[PDB]
Design a protein around this ligand. Structure first.
Ligand code: A1JHB
Lengths: 194, 198
């Protein structure tokens, strides 16, 4: 049941579809980035159309919607990576084993400026940096700490009912960590330069 | 969307169903077990009915069935563990971030065994305070596999030059696999828990 803003894929399950500048979908994502990265130069933005990844994600969302009894568990966040990992993320999404102050999961930033550090979006031979815009099932979150391998239990008297993610600051989060596969869908890849 | 032989759970999402000796369901797991673990005795075998783990697992199996070419992608394997992990694995399944280092390591992942005798070892199914040992019987999406190597954090690529086209799992020996290692959540479904003792 693939989102309707996706474009046809000739019966295939994976495409990276480059967005054309000045149409409304591109403008939205660029606005989100330029809010804190207006000083960088956007080379391209690509919509990630991965049927499998999407399917596992929507399963996890339907379950987190049921478990939390409401429907507001998703945030749009950013994630900068190195060029060598982009093929992997396109196809297989985010993976904590590849990645840790608030836990050993995957880190997603609220501000593009954070993902834009060269430590995260390392620039390649030709100078290019890479950053995803990510649907993340953050659901109910709590402050993290170093060494977590899964979020803390909501009530440590029912030790297996867990928060859905952790953050550096609960009242005003600026990063999120999720510890399970298919809790995050990589939705756009922004290719940009300093 | 759940198997039509599970017990009605009444819109619960999880329960454990103790099995009866004599029934084919119980007797086949015991045979499987005692085929290599004849000198341990089974206390009980519980069918794990966990709707969410099932749902995400069946989705991964569907995906591997589509991607591989009429491959028998699923195996029934064993997993010894300690009492303290049973609650977690029951509700949440297997989590590579939690897994032990295997005496012979073929990657950093969750390990499953062909032979119950392997899982039966004290280092996996640690006896709890009452002498009870615990072993899962697991549906594991082994897919297309290759010999692993200790440094692996994901299965290897089938071709170095296409790094994202991955083996689904890895094994200690391709010609006579006795263990498998899986590197992703929801690739193994914990279907029965064997409680056993010496
Ligand atoms: O955008 C990102 N891509 N990849 C990352 O690994 C990443 C990691 C990341 O850390 C935030 C957590 C943190 C804060 C302070 C000291 C140490 C820490 F770990 C933020 C953003 C990103």
């Amino acid at each position: 049941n693939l989102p309707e803003h996706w474009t046809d894929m000739n019966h295939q399950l994976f495409c990276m579809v480059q967005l054309e500048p000045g149409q409304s979908e591109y403008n939205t994502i660029k606005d989100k980035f330029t809010r804190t990265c207006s000083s960088y130069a956007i080379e391209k933005i690509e919509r990630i159309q991965n049927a499998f990844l999407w399917q596992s994600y929507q399963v996890k969302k339907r379950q987190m919607d049921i478990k939390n009894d409401h429907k507001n568990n998703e945030r749009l966040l950013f994630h900068g990576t190195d060029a060598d990992s982009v093929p992997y993320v396109n196809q297989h999404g985010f993976n904590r084993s590849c990645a840790v102050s608030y836990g050993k999961g995957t880190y997603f930033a609220v501000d593009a400026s954070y993902s834009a550090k060269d430590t995260y979006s390392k620039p390649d031979s030709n100078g290019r940096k890479h950053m995803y815009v990510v649907r993340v099932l953050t659901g109910v979150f709590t402050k993290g700490r170093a060494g977590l391998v899964t979020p803390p239990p909501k009530n440590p008297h029912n030790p297996t009912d867990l928060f859905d993610s952790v953050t550096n600051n609960t009242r005003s989060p600026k990063l999120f960590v999720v510890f399970f596969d298919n809790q995050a869908y990589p939705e756009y890849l922004i290719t940009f330069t300093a």
